[PDB]
Each structure stands twice: as structure tokens, then as C-alpha cells.
């Protein structure tokens, strides 16, 4: 959990312009969060990047979890192996606004982070899931009380997010 160079937004929320895959390799975190869907099919966005960085080990483990336990619910999570990226991967399902899901469940999705004293995470329901990323950061700040280190790949979004907090 060697986190450094994050902007400290609040007492417990940190943000950095970084690829979550590269941060995970650098930081060696206890927990990396996946922006998952309910059947843990890691096809695109953050999930695709994390799975490809494990050379599909995450997808094989995820398929076994689903076969045995069935799909997650929106706002839910499970803990699986972090493989080479982290000790654990917390797979968290935020609502997919682009596929017509409800923004109230974004708070429930972020509540899962409170089970872990420190996490490396993406912004939930952002990118291809279609939520306003600045709203997602506000929900994170209001909901998560443990130490969350947010990786935002796109420097422009990072600067927009920091500006919404500082200006
Ligand atoms: O820049 C990117 O492509 C993604 C976009 C994103 C933010 N939240 C998500 C939730 C689900 C799907 C996509 C997104 N953001 C990233 N942030 C940090 N590291 C990353 N590695 C790959 C994408 C990415």
C-alpha cells in the first residue's frame, strides 16, 4: 500500500492521474476495486484492463464464482483474488446509466468500499457506465469513510474533478 503523489481531496479520499493497472503494479495494494457488472464479464473499460493485466486469470476465477454463487446485484460486491495486481480484487457493481440503471444505487455501490481500510479504485459508474464522473466523486466523498485512492486515467477528467473541488 505504497501510495504517493495523490491529491488529498478530504481526510480519507485521494485522487491521482494514473492508469489503475500501472498503480496496482507500483503500489502492490491489499485491495484493487474492479468496476464490475453483475455476471463479472470483464469485456471493456476498467474491468477489461484489469483482466487483461492478469492474462485472463481474473476472468477464469470470476466464471467459477458466478457458476457457484450466481450474479451480483447492482450496488453489490464480492471479494476475489487480486492475482498479480493486489492481494484481493473487490468487484463492485455501480449502476450503468448508459444501459438505463438508477443513480440511487451508486451510493450502495460505494458503501462496499467501507469493508476495506485502504483501497485502490476507479470512479464507479464513470467511463462506459455513463454516470457524471464529478457526481460519482461527490458520492464517493459522502459515502466512503475508509482510505480510498482513486486512479483517473484521463488527465483532462482528473483536472475537471480537481477543479470542481478547488474552484
Ligand atoms: O479512462 C478510462 O478508460 C477509464 C474510464 C472509467 C472510469 N470509471 C469507469 C468504470 C467502468 C468503466 C470505465 C470507467 N478510467 C480508468 N481509470 C483508471 N485506470 C484505468 N485503466 C483503464 C481505464 C482506466
Residue numbers in the entry: 4 to 170
Please quote the paper that reports this structure.
For CoVs, the conserved macrodomain is encoded within non-structural protein 3 (nsp3) and is called Mac1. Mac1 binds to and removes ADP-ribose from protein, countering host PARPs. Much like macrodomains that had been discovered from species such as archaea, the viral macrodomains form an αβα sandwich-like structure with several β-sheets surrounded by α-helices on both sides, with a highly defined ADP-ribose binding pocket. Furthermore, as Mac1 is completely conserved across all CoVs and is vital for viral pathogenesis, it could be a unique therapeutic target for SARS-CoV-2 and other potential pandemic CoVs.
Using a series of amino acid-based 7H-pyrrolo[2,3-d] pyrimidines, we previously created compound 4a (S), derived from tryptophan, that inhibited SARS-CoV-2 Mac1 binding to ADP-ribose with a 6.1 μM IC50 value. 4a also inhibited Mac1 enzyme activity and bound to Mac1, as demonstrated by a thermal shift profile similar to Mac1’s natural ligand, ADP-ribose. We solved the structure of 4a with Mac1 and refined it to 1.1 Å resolution. In this structure, some of the key features are a hydrogen bond with D22 and the backbone of I23, multiple hydrogen bonds between the carboxylate with neighboring water molecules, and finally a hydrogen bond between the indole NH and L126. F156, previously seen to form pi-stacking interactions with ADP-ribose and inhibitors, has considerable flexibility, and although it is next to the pyrrolo-pyrimidine and contributes to hydrophobic interactions, the geometry does not allow pi-stacking interactions. Structural visualization highlights compound 4a binding within the protein pocket, forming hydrogen bonds and hydrophobic interactions with residues D22, F156, D157, and others. Pyrrolo-pyrimidine-based compounds are promising candidates as Mac1 inhibitors due to their molecular mimicry of adenine, which enables them to fit effectively into the ADP-ribose binding pocket of Mac1. Compounds 4a/4b have a negatively charged carboxylic acid moiety at physiological pH, which we hypothesized might preclude its ability to cross cellular membranes. Based on the co-crystal structure of 4a and the docking model of 4b, the esterification could create some steric clash with the pyrimidine in the active conformation binding to Mac1.
